[PDB]
Structures are given as C-alpha cells and as structure tokens.
Amino acid sequence: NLGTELDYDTFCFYYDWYGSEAIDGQYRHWAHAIAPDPNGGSGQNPGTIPGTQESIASNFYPQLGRYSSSDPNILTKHMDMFVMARTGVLALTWWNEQDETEAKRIGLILDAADKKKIKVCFHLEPYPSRNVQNLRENIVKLITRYGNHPAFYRKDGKPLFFIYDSYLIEPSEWEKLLSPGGSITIRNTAYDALMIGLWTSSPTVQRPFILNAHFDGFYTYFAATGFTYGSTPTNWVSMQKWAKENGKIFIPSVGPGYIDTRIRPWNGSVIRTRTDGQYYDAMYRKAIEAGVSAISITSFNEWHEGSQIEPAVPYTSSEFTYLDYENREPDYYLTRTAYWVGKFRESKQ
C-alpha cells in the first residue's frame, strides 16, 4: 500500500509507428507529410517534414530522440516510463498493416510490457475498408495471436478494444457484431470483448448511436478541450450519469495539451497550451470528479499532435525552435500522471 502500484483502469494511448533509418530503413513518422488545409484552395503543395535531427514532425522534441518503436531498448525505457506514470494499460494503435514488421513490433511491445506488469489492449484505427466483418476477423486474429500472452489486457475476464471514429460505421452494422442477437455476434463467444466506441457530438446524436450500436462503453479521445462535445469536460458529469443509467462504461480521455501545427499548420485554433501542467491538472480533475470507473490518457506519444506525456527536452535547431516543458522537467508529465492516478484510486471503491 505504497501509492506506487500500477492502475489497471488507466489506459494510455500509445503509438508504435516511429522508425529510424538503422532499424526501419527510414526515420518513419519523424518524417511526415504536411496536411493541406481542408478549407484552403487548390494547388496546395504543402510539402513534407524530412525527419532529420533538426526537423521532425512534432512541435516538441523527444528526450529519447528520433527513436524506433521496434527498438527493444526504447521499449524497455517506455515501460519504465509507464511504471513511473502508474498507467497499467498501454492502448496500442492498430492499423491492420498485415506486415511482418507490425507483427514483430506488437510481440516486442507485449514482451516488454510483461516485464513490468503492464498490460496491452488495442486501439482499432480507421484502416481501409474497415467494416464489422473484417473487424470481427481482426478481433479473432488478435485474441488468437495475443490473447494468451501474459501482458494481454482483460477486464473482468474480457478483452477491451477502443474503436476510433466508430461513427464511420452505422449502428445497424455495429448491431450485427455487438448485439447478443447479431448476425455475426461476438457475444457469448470465445471472442467476446468490451467494445468502447468514440462519443463525439451532442447527446441527441450519441445516445441513440451508442445504444443502437450495442457498444459496451465510450471514450472521448481528443486532448483538446472543446474540440467536440465529448471532449468538453463540463459535460462529463452528465455523460457519466447517462452511462450509469444505461449500463455503459464511460472512459473519458484526458491530456496535457494539444498542438499539431508542424503537420497541420492551418489547425492552430485547436492549440491548447500546457501552462506548466495546469491544463493537465484541470482536465484530469474533471474526469475524477465525474465519478468514472476508468480513465484514458491522450497520449503517451502522439508527438505529431503535441498531446504526449512522454519526456520532451528543450531543443533549438537551425530549422525549428521546439516547444518544451518550460518550467517543468522532462519527466514532469509522467510524475504528474502518477499523482492523478493516486487521486483517481482514492476516488474508486
């Protein structure tokens, strides 16, 4: 009873898409295309961030440098960071790449996590032609491949998946997978799971979406307060009340800030300043005050979006002056996460 143990109702969104020339053949994701402005003109040639030491696809700069997500030595360090943050579940981005390098990295992440008693669940991304049939097939494959790994997460006996942009699939399709009577149900099968859909907009839209889709619960993802109704923390008390009334698990997402203008220069209105941790504190406090059972953290390491809690260092290169943790040390967001996990646990019975 030391106040240092991992919390297994705390999910931290993790991205495994970073590469180095030496391990991966290219400094993958550190190099990244710049997105055209969706409200902008034709003939934009926005260019690319080259992923050199000097110019990476983030407004911040990793303490660990331009690392590979396939480097077992980096993974070790990441797991130690999870232990410092007390975040017991790594919620792994999953893009259905169907390639050996994906398969290798997932096994490495599971192995490294297990050494530290961290668990892994999957965050099912909007891969091409995603639909409920190939989602079922992929859930079966992930549970078959990884379900007996000691680090594979279960909650009261069930795997858990987060489904990003779940609204891209109609509730009538979801029902087929997620109702106990659905044509291709997972309920009561070896492949049953807690399925957590993304609550985006107003209750008039989201309440029937979640019920009609038969999701087990919902999360909000966005680290930027006010980006959606669901990512506006003053709505969380009423979202939790509805969840409780309807037998759903609400897993609000909290984050330390947001800034993605290296890769999305037109998206400055979504910037949320970190204010030496005060933003993170405010958001985490709202989640805990809402009385939820589980919390998700956006993010461990979405460096493109500036939501990371992973350590960052000051850096000024000839090409860019990076943001940094300012008056706080590089590991502040890890140790502040541990503080909040303790407050969250204090709140759970």
Ligand X SMILES: OC[C@H]1CN[C@@H](O)[C@@H](O[C@H]2O[C@H](CO)[C@@H](O)[C@H](O)[C@@H]2O)[C@@H]1O
Ligand Y SMILES: OC[C@H]1O[C@H](O[C@H]2[C@@H](O)[C@H](O)[C@@H](CO)O[C@@H]2O)[C@@H](O)[C@@H](O)[C@@H]1O
User: Out of 87, 185, 200, 337, which residue is the one contacting ligand Y (CB under 6 A)?
Assistant: 200
Residue 305 binds to ligand X (criterion: CB under 6 A): yes
Residue 305 binds to ligand Y (criterion: CB under 6 A): yes
Tell me whether residue 5 or residue 165 sits nearer to ligand Y (CB atom): 165
Q: Where are the alpha helices (DSSP H) in 179-296?
A: 203-213, 236-245, 278-289
User: Out of 214, 272, 304, 336, which residue is the one contacting ligand X (CB under 6 A)?
Assistant: 304
Per-residue exposure over 287-299, b if at least 16 CB sit within 10 Å of its own CB, e if not: bbebebbbbbbbb
Tell me whether residue 52 or residue 131 sits nearer to ligand Y (CB atom): 131
User: Out of 7, 192, 216, 302, which residue is the one contacting ligand X (CB under 6 A)?
Assistant: 302
State the number of binding residues for ligand Y (CB under 6 A).
7
Between 91 and 110, how does the x/- string for binding to ligand X read (CB under 6 A)? --x-----------------
Q: Which helix (H) or strand (E) holds 240?
A: helix 236-245
Helix (H, G, I), strand (E, B) or coil at 94: strand
User: Out of 111, 114, 125, 331, which residue is the one contacting ligand X (CB under 6 A)?
Assistant: 125
**Nearest in space to 163 (alpha carbons), one of 13, 346, 339, 328:** 13
Show the tokens assigned to 75: 């993974």
Q: Which does 304 bind (CB under 5 to 8 A by kind): ligand X, ligand Y, none?
A: ligand X
Helix (H, G, I), strand (E, B) or coil at 137: helix
What CA–CA distance (Å, rounded) separates 71 from 21?
Answer: 12
What CA–CA distance (Å, rounded) separates 127 from 140?
Answer: 17
- Minimum separation from the CB atom of position 298 to ligand X (A): 8
- Minimum separation from the CB atom of position 164 to ligand X (A): 4
307-22-259 Cα angle (round to 5): 15
Considering only residues 251 to 270 of the shown chain, the ones binding ligand Y according to CB under 6 A are 260, 264, 267
What CA–CA distance (Å, rounded) separates 208 from 349?
Answer: 30
Q: Which does 130 bind (CB under 5 to 8 A by kind): ligand Y, ligand X, none?
A: none
Are residues 46 and 34 in contact, defined by beta-carbon separation less than 8 angstroms? yes
Alpha-carbon 90 to chain mean position: 8
- Minimum separation from the CB atom of position 123 to ligand X (A): 6
Residue 5 binds to ligand Y (criterion: CB under 6 A): no
Residue 130 binds to ligand X (criterion: CB under 6 A): no
Q: Which residues contact 111 (CB under 8 A, 6 or more apart)?
A: 151
Chain contacts with ligand X (rule: CB under 6 A)? 93, 123, 125, 164, 302, 304-305
Chain contacts with ligand Y (rule: CB under 6 A)? 165, 200, 228, 260, 264, 267, 305
